[PDB]
Automatic annotation (TrEMBL), chain A:
<protein>
    <recommendedName>
        <fullName>Tyrosine-protein kinase ephrin type A/B receptor-like domain-containing protein</fullName>
    </recommendedName>
</protein>
<feature type="disulfide bond">
    <location>
        <begin position="34"/>
        <end position="46"/>
    </location>
</feature>
<feature type="disulfide bond">
    <location>
        <begin position="3"/>
        <end position="17"/>
    </location>
</feature>
<feature type="disulfide bond">
    <location>
        <begin position="20"/>
        <end position="43"/>
    </location>
</feature>
Amino acid sequence: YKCPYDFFADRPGVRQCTACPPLDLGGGNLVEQCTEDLGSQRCKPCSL
Amino acid sequence: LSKPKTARTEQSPPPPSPSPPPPPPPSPRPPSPNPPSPRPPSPAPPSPN
Ligand SMILES: *[C@@H]1O[C@H](CO)[C@H](O)[C@H](O)[C@H]1O
Ligand SMILES: *[C@H]1O[C@H](CO)[C@H](O)[C@H](O)[C@H]1O
Ligand SMILES: *[C@H]1O[C@H](CO)[C@H](O)[C@H](O)[C@H]1O
Ligand SMILES: *[C@H]1O[C@H](CO)[C@H](O)[C@H](O)[C@H]1O
Ligand SMILES: *[C@H]1O[C@H](CO)[C@H](O)[C@H](O)[C@H]1O
Ligand SMILES: *[C@H]1O[C@H](CO)[C@H](O)[C@H](O)[C@H]1O
Ligand SMILES: *[C@H]1O[C@H](CO)[C@H](O)[C@H](O)[C@H]1O
C-alpha cells in the first residue's frame, strides 16, 4: 500500500511506514513536518 | 525561525520627541527720516536815508 498522507518510508521492503519527525531548530522549539503527496519517501516542514 | 516572537527580550524604544517650533515673523523696521527743516525768514531790505 502507499504510505499514509503524513507518513513516509525509504527502504524498499518495509512492514510499516514511519511518521514524519519534527524538525529541530534549537532549544524547546520543534516544527512539525508533513508530506506533500500520498506515497512519498521524504518529509518537509509542514508550514511551507 | 529559532527564537519566536515570545522570546524577544529587548524593551521597545521610546516614541519620537516632539518637533521644534517655527521661526518668528520678520521684525519691523526703524522709523524713516523726518523731512528737512524749514529755512528761516529773510532780512528785510535796506531802510531809507
Ligand atoms: C520709513 O523708513 C524705512 C527704512 O527703510 C522704510 O524705507 C519705509 O518705507 C519708510 O517709510
Ligand atoms: C517594542 O520593540 C521591542 C524590540 O526591542 C519588541 O519588539 C516589543 O515587542 C515591541 O513592543
Ligand atoms: C524626546 O521625547 C521622546 C519620547 O517622547 C524621548 O523620551 C526622548 O528621550 C526625548 O528627547
Ligand atoms: C518634527 O520632529 C519630530 C522628531 O523630532 C517628528 O519627526 C515630527 O514628525 C516632526 O514634525
Ligand atoms: C522682530 O522679530 C524678532 C523675533 O526674534 C525679534 O526678536 C523681535 O521680536 C523683533 O525685532
Ligand atoms: C532769505 O531767507 C532765507 C535764508 O535766511 C532764504 O535763503 C531766502 O531765500 C532768502 O530770501
Ligand atoms: C527800514 O526797513 C527795516 C526793515 O528791516 C527796518 O524796519 C527799519 O526800521 C526801517 O527804517
